[PDB]
């Protein structure tokens, strides 16, 4: 059984970073080489694991988190980072054990008039916990008066759009990100690459 990595990386549309999507991977053989072999991954930084010796160990579960951000925000998809993405949209823990994968998708997620399909959270009362998701559409109260559910003075809609256009600079062009989390709980292994679990035969 091959792990459905094609469904995650080759998706027609990705999720907004504020509502980042997670696909749990379990009970399959993971051809990690197929990853690095198919798209030109502009960023491929692994934390706590080794990309050269990937498909040699096992894991209880593997989580694939995918979303879209601009180019200059890919640096926020890393442990101990700050910014609108790391604080309000997608936060990685300090002891992150996994890989962060990102590639430019200007040909897919940009249009001449502006692709307002992808959003991000601009305001929030507090920072996000690691792997926390906030999809609420509550009007952010910046002042000391209630907003009554509509935007106004010191009352802003919390989500903002990118409006990707193909003529933007590389720092403002869309980038599709895939975050691979590797979990190892007190359970037998379920996701292994080419490891010595051929013994199942």
């Amino acid at each position: 059984n091959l792990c459905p990595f094609h469904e995650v990386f080759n998706a027609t549309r990705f999720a907004s970073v504020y509502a980042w999507n997670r696909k749990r991977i379990s009970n399959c053989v993971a051809d990690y080489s197929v990853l690095y072999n198919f798209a030109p991954f502009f960023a491929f930084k692994c934390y706590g694991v080794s990309p050269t010796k990937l498909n040699d160990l096992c894991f209880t579960n593997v989580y694939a988190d995918s979303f879209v951000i601009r180019g200059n925000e890919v640096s926020q998809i890393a442990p101990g980072q700050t910014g609108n993405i790391a604080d309000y949209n997608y936060k990685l823990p300090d002891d992150f054990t996994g890989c962060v994968i990102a590639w430019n998708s200007n040909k897919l997620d940009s249009k001449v008039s502006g692709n307002y399909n992808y959003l991000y959270r601009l305001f929030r009362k507090s920072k996000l916990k690691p792997f926390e998701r906030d999809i609420s559409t509550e009007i952010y109260q910046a002042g000391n008066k209630p907003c009554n559910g509509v935007a106004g003075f010191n009352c802003y809609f919390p989500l903002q759009s990118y409006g990707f256009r193909p003529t933007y600079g590389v720092g403002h062009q869309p980038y599709r990100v895939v975050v691979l989390s590797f979990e190892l709980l007190h359970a037998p292994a379920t996701v292994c690459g080419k490891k010595s679990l051929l013994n199942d035969i």
């Binding site: 305001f123 910046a142 409006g163 933007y168 403002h172």
Partner: protein, 596 residues
């Protein structure tokens, strides 16, 4: 949450919405200037109207945060720039009257035509008809006709509009708590709250007049030398002690004496440095010009042009059906998009213009990290001064020989140096008294120091006294000769060209010292000097975040505008001019006139 915290969140929401709406308007404006169609005019207007309406709404919302309760100066600068009322402080009736006066004067200026006598059909516009006359014609009567007809048929239409324009602009400026509309314009140099770097609006008047007193000796000898050469060409038209007739100065107003070079060239047997033939001999195209310009900024430590620059810019004329506005401009659409629009030809002038325009791009890329409201030059004269110093180094023989366009055997003697400096002074020095006198006249009109029945009387008394230029035809108060210039009838401040001129030689003198340049300042090339590039970049990245006095101090080490580097640049010519005028009268009498 405090008021300052609410403003930081308000400016946070503004920056993200403005960058999107500003990009839509800039892209729609680009698609028109590169593809002049009717559909692109409407899309440019629709996108421009949405951007103008967004600013008017945000200006009202920004005025709900009192500046006195904000202590962070970087936040106060962005709120203050957004709270600027402008014409929105007048009544809806008076603002509608003001916008109608502005559109009519712009329409009269751009559509004003003059028809030659005895043919009501052979008519000429200012561009290109009358401008070709004032720039190439040597006939006294032909130039006199174009000079007088432009002011008696187009300028007289602007006289009643300009009187009501001053009234409404003064009401607008005084409602924004300014003395007058001239004091409103001088707010571009104002700095408050920064100890040791403050600058008042009235201080600009004193600094411009103080530095102009030091320019007088150089200009009087340039004026005297030009008068002597022109007197040999028109012996019966020019007095050896009088002012210069206004219609014999190289253009419609005498703003630049550049076209007087053919008649005033000191050594008219030594040719100019024109590497245009060399560029065609080496099969140079427009991409080669901008590539050489890119290598120039890289040699001093500046970044190369973005990939989107080479892909999105229009560095050549589209030609054939697709029409475009061929005026060279530098575009900062935002969000990493930087372009240059230019119908480049394989000439030396376009080679130097490419370095001038790419200098604007380097300025934009430097302060792109600043907040949206702080992405501009330190003041109105900074951006154009940065572009000027690039063509200064790129035009030197030292630079032209290092890139293979000028022959190494080509030697430079002091006769070609004087020819170059004289050509430079006709444009650079010749425009400083014109600029200061014009702007001082408008300052006094707005301040109320010149009555309506004495507008044209005071205008030409100041032309004779300050500029040393006399009108060829007497003009009563039905004329409006200042409005016959674009900037006056289109409501643009003019002192920016005076401050920019002194800024660029302060910049050049400072960067050339960092480049360890030896010899006269006019022969300097800052190429391959990363130290000079670092010193310039320390000001470019500031944008509007810091006072212009501090931004200027990062380059030149001084906090104020200085005229000494300008005089240091033209000193080899100034000593040569004084020797040429040893048997000539230096100065001018204001009572002589060609119609006396």
């Amino acid at each position: 949450s405090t008021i300052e915290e609410q403003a930081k969140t308000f400016l946070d929401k503004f920056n993200h919405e403005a960058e999107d709406l500003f990009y839509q308007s800039s892209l729609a404006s680009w698609n028109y200037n590169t593809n002049i169609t009717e559909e692109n005019v409407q899309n440019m207007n629709n996108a421009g109207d949405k951007w103008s309406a967004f600013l008017k709404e945000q200006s009202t919302l920004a005025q709900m945060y009192p500046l006195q309760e904000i202590q962070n100066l970087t936040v106060k600068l962005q709120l203050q720039a957004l709270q600027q009322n402008g014409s929105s402080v007048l009544s809806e009736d008076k603002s509608k009257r003001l916008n109608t006066i502005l559109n009519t004067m712009s329409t009269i200026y751009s559509t004003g035509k003059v028809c030659n006598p005895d043919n009501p059909q052979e008519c000429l516009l200012l561009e290109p008809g009358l401008n070709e006359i004032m720039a190439n014609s040597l006939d006294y009567n032909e130039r006199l006709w174009a000079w007088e007809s432009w002011r008696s048929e187009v300028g007289k239409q602007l006289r009643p509009l300009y009187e009501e324009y001053v009234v409404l602009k003064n009401e607008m400026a005084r409602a924004n708590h300014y003395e007058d509309y001239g004091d409103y314009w001088r707010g571009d140099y104002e700095v408050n709250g920064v100890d040791g770097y403050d600058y008042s609006r009235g201080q600009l008047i004193e600094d411009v007049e103080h530095t102009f007193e030091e320019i007088k000796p150089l200009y009087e000898h340039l004026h005297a030398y030009v008068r002597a050469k022109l007197m040999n060409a028109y012996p019966s038209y020019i007095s050896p002690i009088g002012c210069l007739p206004a219609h014999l100065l190289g253009d419609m107003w005498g703003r630049f004496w550049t076209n007087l070079y053919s008649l005033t060239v000191p050594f008219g047997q030594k040719p100019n440095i024109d590497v245009t033939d060399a560029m065609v001999d080496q099969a140079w195209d427009a991409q080669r010009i901008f590539k050489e310009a890119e290598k120039f900024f890289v040699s001093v430590g500046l970044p190369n042009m973005t990939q989107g620059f080479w892909e999105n810019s229009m560095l050549t004329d589209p030609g054939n059906v697709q029409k475009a506005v061929c005026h060279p401009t530098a575009w900062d659409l935002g969000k990493g998009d930087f372009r240059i629009l230019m119908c480049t030809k394989v000439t030396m002038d376009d080679f130097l213009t490419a370095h001038h325009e790419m200098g604007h791009i380097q300025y934009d890329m430097a302060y792109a990290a600043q907040p949206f409201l702080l992405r501009n030059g330190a003041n109105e004269g900074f951006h154009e001064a940065v572009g000027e110093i690039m063509s200064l180094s790129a035009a030197t023989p030292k630079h032209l020989k290092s890139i293979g366009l000028l022959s190494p055997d080509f030697q430079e003697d002091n006769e070609t140096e004087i020819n170059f400096l004289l050509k430079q002074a006709l444009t650079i020095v010749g425009t400083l008294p014109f600029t200061y006198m014009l702007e001082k006249w408008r300052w006094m009109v707005f301040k109320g120091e010149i009555p309506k029945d004495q507008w044209m009387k005071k205008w030409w008394e100041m032309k004779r006294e300050i500029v040393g230029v006399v009108e060829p035809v007497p003009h009563d108060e039905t004329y409006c000769d200042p409005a016959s210039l674009f900037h006056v009838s289109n409501d643009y401040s003019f002192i920016r060209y005076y401050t920019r001129t002194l800024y660029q030689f302060q910049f050049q003198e400072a960067l050339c010292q960092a480049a360890k340049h030896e010899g006269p300042l006019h022969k300097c090339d800052i190429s391959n000097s990363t130290e000079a590039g670092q010193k310039l970049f320390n000001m470019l990245r500031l944008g509007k975040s810091e006072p212009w006095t501090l931004a200027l101090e990062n380059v030149v080490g001084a906090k104020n505008m200085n005229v000494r580097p300008l005089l240091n640049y033209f000193e080899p010519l100034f000593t040569w001019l004084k020797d040429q005028n040893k048997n000539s009268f230096v100065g001018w009498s204001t009572d002589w006139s060609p119609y006396a």
